Symmetry: D2
Subunit: 368 residues, 4 copies
């Protein structure tokens, strides 16, 4: 039979629908993956306003349903994590180790790319539909290129836990460990304790930060922050321009000097320079949200030797980073189980989105 | 109490050649007979700090008189001046960031410091007068702390060449070597080919950059850039907002990809984000001018993984870096002699300042 | 001139509990009332230096008396001691390498004699002769005369001075070897050869830094059980005959799935194992030799082959004023397990037992408390 | 399709070599046939005489594409190519770390034949497959290689002799300074052994901005060459100086009582493998470039204190990244490739080029076709 996969589709007018997408047999370098769990990221919300129809979802874990003619490393029944780098392995950036900004295949930096499965293989209302971030994980079956999958091998695997590795975990963890290269014993400030920020916090704790200050406008998020390793919390005011008041409090909590590292995770474009306010001179400020607007910045915030970086996807190298995360999860340091606040069914995607936006969840996941 | 002919900036935008009353040195201080004093763009800015100052923060000379506790200097020793005057004991000094010393930096801690000679030691209109950047080199005789000098030992020393080490050379060289850590074989864009920018260019050539693209609005400065290492020149539009036309030309010149490194040192506040437009993803953008204003930034310029840094004084560690610069001068790699465009007597400071702003000099020096 | 009960090594191989005359501090000096002193093998070695020594190079205490120039410290201040006593002005100090200070380091610049990091030689007298203090400190004493560069101020209620006293040497060395020297990255794999005072702190530091696998190796199975306390994920009983631990390297590759570890640390004090961490790591891995070896040894140079970084760091690249307060915070946070490292506390008059227990391998760390 | 009889230098596996013909066959889909224009000589080519198996010698070369396999789309007949012996797979753990030079699948050093080598039946001698040295075999009129072995360049009036030595001597010396040591401008550097590799180490320290560059050799002709490539200081070592201990004292003398920031050992002498440690100050960086596969005796005080010691392979070459950077440094005049070509040889005079190498008469010798 022709595969009819129950899916979430964003129509490109601002709204989404639960519906069915027709999914092909894989070409030679593609796989058919049965999704067991799909995580929800803030960017899925933004993806409703892209102005083109897409199968939604770019966090997901599952099992190989069927393999293309030229795939050797994978077979039906294999457990897999999905990544949206889908890197080409030959371009300049891939050879620098920057698989996450692959010049040919990145859905962000190149985009639909050769990291996307063949376009006609996914059909909605009898027409090809794009797969969000080359994946489209809010769907019973996803068609993906081989470079989208990382094979794992775990008994009694919690697939809801595994599904969030794909974005929130990898981005938050990689921003700490790959980009900032946070040193043990140091002080770290996290601005915004949501899907990404709670993983920055977890990763600061894994990395051995001596002080970890969590900042949010929502008191429920601060309490989650403590679960994942924050040593201090600061409730911000929405009216705190550039979080400048928070910066003075950080200096006071640390004894008169700014933090060694700060991470911005708020999804608020106006707060793009806030991590610079938090750090001492020669500190490291990492802006994780990604901002595509003009904003006004007091350039004094850059003064003096502060490193500022806006990294993509935590500098993800999927076949390298995902097994390292899996090992930290199994060891007990990476707290993926506790991060899954609620599981939902695909029909209740709206309630899951609302619980995310309302600040009720660390991470919500759709389970199939 | 000696009378030293000096350039004093009154706190109104104006200066006057006058006499400053200099006292004998305290136990940890020194009287330096200035042989040559370099001119920095910042000396122009210092006219409009609303306080009387003994101008000048670049200089070389000979030790005139030594205080009680000075053990390794004597009358007659050749010395270079530095304005870091580091305390050697605070957190930043112990980090090796002597240039942002939390106690003595005239920039970071002034706003004053123990890096300044005793305030009574320098007087004008019957009042203590401060010495620019703890130095005040545009003066026949300077009173300074020991941490302000670096002893050198040279035969037939060109004091003019030595005088510009104190700021323009250290800042430009250090921004490349200590702050950006530019790798041999890379591509580099330099925006602004002035006293700092020509030393950034020199330092890219010393460092082994494969392509060095010099950018200025003044054709005379581009011809000078070719002397110091530039392999390519771009004449910019004084009305190219954000230098976006220059970015397209860079990508064109480099074969379709942005540069590995870009350095901004135009003294134009609105160009503070410009080096980001010049570099590829994961490139390094260094903002050398130092901007204290609000400016509007297209935050897309930070996407993705670009390192942006605003270093102070090229991360100068004077007793370490100044001898390395002297060796590079002696070796023929650091082209100090070509940088000295004209030598002025103190009474002609105005003409020196005019030639500075008219773009007629790489460096002008005042000679005594 | 105050009289301080002290452990003096006589040089002949013996030591005695005695009293040592300690002057008031000159202007850059200060008198510390030692609360606790850690013990390690170096103190046994200071019995055979062939000159009378005030023993002890690990300690924590309280300022008793301050010299005329000291401004940072006052009577009653809690202090940790460090044996780097850096000068802050030489090339290495300006490089951030205070632990190898060209002027004051008792290891680098102490060539039989003592350095300017030592308090003035006449400030400590035994039998009418001036007496040298071990590593510029002499902490196995009720009152120690030291330079300001030797102490790091801290402020804690209910401070476990015994825990505090071991930061001075083994903790700094093993933690620093991981964090400052190897700069171990979270998620990686690490092998630790030798699980004594240094090695257990290497293991703790790998755990603190977030290694995904931590393989402990020792010839003493009791030490492997301890290694599990401090965070080891896997343990290997090494065979004392195994030359260069070639069998252990094979087992490491098996445990890890076919490739060497990212990092390996050698803490065995066995000269012939100096190159062993090379055998444990993959190509382009990092091999850290913590022991310090001064003998000629024969090395199969294929072990270096191919991009392995090899380093023999001193004192964990300690910058005392920066690193000791960070360690204190990790202790307060619960991550650095100082309390669990203290196997036994001793009286100064018990020093003979504490050295016997140490040489017998009975302790993780022994501490003298006053 | 035909079977080319390629005149070649073959090491027989008995310690000798011969000039002979090797049969080279049609390239498979991911392979290609290269007409060699020039082949450099590296000290390792002489070590390959002792490997105990027949090999087509040579692992430095530059040439033009003679024929492209079915699936090659980025190269055509006539294209200029530099050869590299990393032949990286691009998918293993090391390749994804950026360490294509120690590829776990394809490296002829760390894996080897490998899938970095062209199909084994494609090169034949005495009726049976013959391995190509370092997956290349450049001392031959035509080489059969994998696509991963070539870097396309385009340059009018290219000097192929200068281009041929990028393949090993230049990349190893340059990369050991810039990729491994990460030598910082203004620092002091000591180079032990001024040969094919050491002279490129010296060039790369000059390119990188070292303030002091101290060349050391037992051969006075090499010290004169070293000055051409940027040495500010030269020291004639004695063959009697165990560990180069007296040289170490003179390095400190020359640097005002202090050890150097960086030292590179390039001597091909196994007993000298620890020598760079004695040249450097505490927290200095010592780079052992030769590669030693023997037991030696090391005074372990040489490691004392924070000295980084490292034995890098092939200058950490990522050939598609590094080789274009080297080509640009050559074109702008900083990398002095032309000046490294001391003498050019016919293939039949390969014996003379090997004696000239071992006698120390050349910077680099190349065979031209
Ligand atoms: N760079 C990347 O590769 C990458 C990857 C994933 C997500 N993102 C981006 O990261 C951002 C955050 O993602 P998320 O899933 O964690 O979203 P989220 O909604 O789960 O978390 C946002 C958090 O920021 C808090 N916050 C809002 N305003 C604040 C303020 N003024 N001060 C302090 N805290 C404030 C919110 O309460 C919330 O807890 C999104 O913009 C998303 O697009 C980037
Ligand atoms: N970070 C530090 O420690 C430090 C130290 C010294 C100076 N500075 C700062 O560096 C800046 C430059 O100093 P300087 O002495 O080199 O000044 P300068 O006047 O000598 O040179 C500035 C150059 O920028 C050129 N320029 C102006 N507008 C341009 C444009 N739109 N595009 C391209 N080029 C343009 C000018 O033609 C001139 O050549 C000053 O703002 C100064 O305060 C910083
Ligand atoms: N670099 C520095 O600054 C510094 C500072 C302090 C101590 N050290 C040195 O570190 C070394 C270790 O000191 P320590 O106090 O931990 O000594 P220790 O005796 O307490 O521990 C050494 C451990 O190595 C084990 N071991 C012995 N042989 C072994 C083998 N063949 N294989 C595996 N394990 C073996 C032993 O069982 C013992 O547990 C000493 O040499 C000491 O001199 C160096
Ligand atoms: N790590 C790698 O990837 C790599 C790559 C190429 C070559 N190599 C190795 O590098 C080494 C050098 O190769 P090469 O082609 O430059 O050889 P070479 O023969 O051209 O040069 C060796 C130099 O060392 C000199 N020398 C000999 N003894 C000396 C001594 N006691 N003191 C000082 N100098 C001495 C010689 O006079 C000669 O100039 C070889 O062992 C070779 O196998 C390694
Ligand atoms: Na941890
Ligand atoms: Na250069
Ligand atoms: Zn996402
Ligand atoms: Zn790519
Ligand atoms: Zn200036
Ligand atoms: Zn300071
Ligand atoms: Zn000890
Ligand atoms: Zn020192
Ligand atoms: Zn070679
Ligand atoms: Zn590979």
């Amino acid at each position: 039979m022709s595969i009819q996969s129950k899916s979430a589709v964003a129509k490109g007018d601002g709204s989404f629908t639960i519906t069915h997408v027709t999914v092909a047999e894989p070409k030679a370098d593609e796989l058919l993956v049965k999704i067991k769990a799909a995580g929800l990221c803030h960017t899925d919300y933004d993806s409703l306003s892209w102005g083109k129809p897409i199968v939604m979802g770019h966090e997901g874990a599952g099992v190989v349903e069927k393999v293309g003619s030229d795939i050797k490393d994978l077979k039906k029944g294999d457990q897999v994590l999905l990544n949206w780098a889908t890197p080409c392995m030959h371009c300049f950036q891939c050879q620098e180790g920057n698989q996450h900004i692959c010049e040919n295949n990145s859905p962000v930096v190149a985009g639909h790319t050769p990291g996307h499965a063949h376009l006609e293989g996914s059909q909605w209302e009898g027409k090809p539909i794009e797969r969000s971030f080359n994946l489209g994980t809010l769907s019973e079956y996803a068609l993906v290129k081989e470079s989208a999958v990382v094979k794992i091998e775990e008994e009694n695997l919690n697939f809801s836990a595994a599904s969030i590795i794909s974005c929130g975990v990898m981005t938050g963890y990689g921003s700490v460990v790959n980009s900032a290269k946070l040193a043990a014993g140091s002080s770290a400030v996290i601005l915004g304790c949501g899907g990404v920020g709670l993983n920055v916090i977890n990763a600061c704790e894994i990395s051995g930060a001596g002080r970890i200050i969590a900042v949010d406008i929502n008191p429920n998020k601060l309490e989650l922050a403590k679960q994942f390793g924050a040593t201090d919390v600061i409730l911000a005011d929405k009216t705190d321009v550039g979080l400048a008041n928070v910066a003075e409090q950080v200096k006071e909590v640390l004894g008169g000097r700014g933090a060694d590292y700060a991470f911005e995770c708020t999804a608020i474009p106006a707060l793009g320079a806030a991590p610079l306010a938090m750090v001492r001179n020669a500190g490291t400020a990492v802006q994780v949200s990604g901002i595509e607007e003009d904003i006004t910045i007091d350039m004094r915030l850059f003064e003096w030797d502060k490193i500022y970086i806006n990294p993509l996807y935590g500098k993800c190298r999927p076949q390298i980073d995902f097994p390292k995360l899996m090992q930290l999860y199994k060891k007990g340091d990476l707290k993926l189980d506790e991060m899954i606040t609620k599981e939902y069914k695909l029909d209740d995607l709206q309630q899951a989105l609302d619980d995310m936006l309302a600040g009720k969840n660390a991470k919500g996941v759709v389970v199939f």
